[PDB]
Amino acid sequence: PGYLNDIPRHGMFVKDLILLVNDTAAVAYDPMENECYLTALAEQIPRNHSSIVTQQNQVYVVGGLYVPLQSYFFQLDNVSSEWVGLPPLPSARCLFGLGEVDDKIYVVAGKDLQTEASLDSVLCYDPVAAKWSEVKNLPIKVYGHNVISHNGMIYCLGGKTDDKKCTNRVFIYNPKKGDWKDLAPMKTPRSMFGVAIHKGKIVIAGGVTEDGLSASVEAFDLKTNKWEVMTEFPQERSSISLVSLAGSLYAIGGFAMIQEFAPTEVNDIWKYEDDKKEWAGMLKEIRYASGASCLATRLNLFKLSKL
Template sequence: MDGRAGALAEELRVYQMTLLQEGLRNLLDEDKFVDCILKVGDKDLPCHRLVLAACSPHFRAMFLSNEVSDEGEQPAAQRKGKKENLDVQVPKEVVLDDVDPTIMEDILRYLYTSEIDITDDNVQGIFSVANIFQIPSIFTVCVSYLQRRLGLGNCLSVFRLGLLLDCPRLAVVARDYIAERFSAVAKDPDFLELAPHELIAIISANGLNVEREEEVFETVLSWAKADREARMNSLPDVFDCIRFRLMSIEFFRDKVEKNEFVKADPQLQKNLQLVKDAFDGKIPDANKDAGSAKDSKSKDVESDVEQEMPLLPSILNDNRRFGMFNKELILLVNDEAAVAYDPLGNECFLAAISAQQVPKNHSCIVTRENQVFVAGGLHHNEENKDNPYQSYFLQFDHLECEWIGMPPMPSARCLFSLGEAENSIYSIGGQELTGNTTLDSVLCYDRKSFKWGESDPLPYKVYGHSVVSHKGLVYVLGGKTPEKKCLNKMLVYNPKKFEWKELPPMNVARSLCGATVHKNKIWVVAGVVDNGLTASVEMYDIASNKWEIAVEFPQERSSINLVSSNGVMYAIGGFAMVKNEKEEFEPREINDVWKLQISAALAQCSLPTFQLFINSSTSSSAGISYAITVCTLLGQKQAHHTIPYHTQILPACK
């Protein structure tokens, strides 16, 4: 059959199916040949048994068994001479208990029209009913809908629904989604409600996106503490899925062996003795019976290839998780794109195209859980007369390589800074976009409830300041007063005590300076002073509560970005006063990278050649190419290079 003949056959098939479906729908609308009434709650739903039987194995079996039963009760002579008259046949009533009438009505309409309105509110109900009555087409539609709508707010319920309805396709997709975002999902209160077999299916996955196995152990402890009595008996099976050999020996001895659950359970102690022996180099002989309790309890969710025999006890599993293969990258973000730079491998990667999502003049932050957020920026919406200025709030999805819109900041502001502690992100101080009013207010975003609120205000109004976060505390450094005077003040906020505290001031009053925590010291580099720019550098020793003067940066700059990565501190970009062709000084954006040497001298860092292609609908060219000069610099200043994106630098984005 050639292509044209095949297309014609397909066209005829679709045409015939359409005619058949429209004919059945017309018969239902005209109440013709109706031989069945579905009694669902307070509703009577007329239909045709033939349609139900054709679409549902459940109804087909029901009607066939009823026919056999009815014929068996009649005399043979009556069955032989019986004359069918469908027009006068009394419709058979079928009572459906424990089914929502509205959902059943939607499903029945779908059988006749192929149309169904699935929403977040009704998808689980439709999914369950379709599963009960074995209607595969609706089942597939619901699975596809849930896969498309999968998110942090519903991934656990979708995963549990997939297990409950024995739908591996849905359960595996949801499980993988949870594994990829394990740190965030584990904070959801619903995570503590997981059944043991559901938890096992998640934490046994190789694709778990965690950097340290200690995080898995601590998550299991939180789950166990939520219902101690009911879950004690399940802990040996759950512990079998924790890869203790990936932990540090110190953590295992101090946190695992001394844990209250371990001390109270002889079976746990016996199992963990195998791990203890393995740390000492004593690996038991593999045997064919060793396996994991998860194998019989995860309901076939794990899709990995069956391991070859023989096997070690599952508690000795030392295969690294997906997240343990990550590397530290420096993320550079502006309104065009996000680029990740690997300073150790000397490589650059395109992380995402901003596509007008990321505004200019924004603030960035990366949390301890490695979540990247962009806040604020300048967006002017001329169509919104009441509130033309908007402050966006975006989160970077490193798996999909795109920016996700989050609840926007309650008020538009600029020249503020972001900090984080516990599960909150703080937008501190700044200026209003209209009126240039300097603020002392602090907005707080709860990452659990996804809501903004007010936090404790600053002791004074400030803008253009720097903020760093360290060990649950938020530090505010420098900035300017409403009178545009630079400050040397330093504050620390303790969210547990709900209080701001003033710390020893900096030696130099400055604003728009670079700041980061490097080796337990807060470094402050360059910035704006009352009479111009500065290249001065100082560092605050958190332990001794004292400031020290450090070596100056090679050039006076403002808005420089600092980042500490892999034990090295980098200084990137900023603005400097540079001579133009007329030998006059003018502000210019600088795109170079420097690193702090062991000798405490700053030396420029080299980058490789890098090209970025961006499709453009406004240009005839295929894209835009950016090249980065490669040079080797050891302790002395060399010819500088440029990088394509530099507006904000974020540490430890992995």
């Protein structure tokens, strides 16, 4: 038979790890070794926030209030493991999406924190010139949507539109011509859900629906590009965090419904088994996942600390 690999690499002490950032710390987690490390303390990181990692290994956080009423913007300094304050998001905003192409970061839509109104406004931070600006607005006003980046394109999915219904709409942003396009919609309109790239499909997991909590897993093949169904999540949950770690799709946490019965956070980890098509329970409880945004990243081991 054939082999997975032809020649071995020389290791450099770099590990693909799940980075869990909440308001106490950014903790690195290795699901295969069931072990955690400290990457950075995070006492200044706002409890309600979104997170993104470049490409380069640059972690950015957007969220909270303020530092004209605004939102914080941080970059993790990988050399010092200190969080850097950056030009703040001009808008105080929640329940938005975060994208990124060629080092530039995109905050899409919201949920104005002052006004309570839905936004279509898209802000792009340029890290060379160190400044934010308004690019083309999203075709809808929305919050509760999710955003992911792939091959220099930005995708916006689901959300709640300006009535208060969930939307199934899917939009693509080309930075090099600056327009949004509707793509084929998802089967299940949803907000507050998990998203990741997984070979090379946009996978979406659970959420709130017109029927409330969902365990539905869909995938947009990037590609046909059609929507197809994957094995449903073991439990109906909102705000599952999906991450692609090396070859594999992980699911971290999410909410509810548990027991008077209310949406309540579960701090567990699951892994999709591609062969078999099953969700496998990895870790029952990880306290570091509580309140945490979740990211796959390539970390230098000798920059981590023992917990």
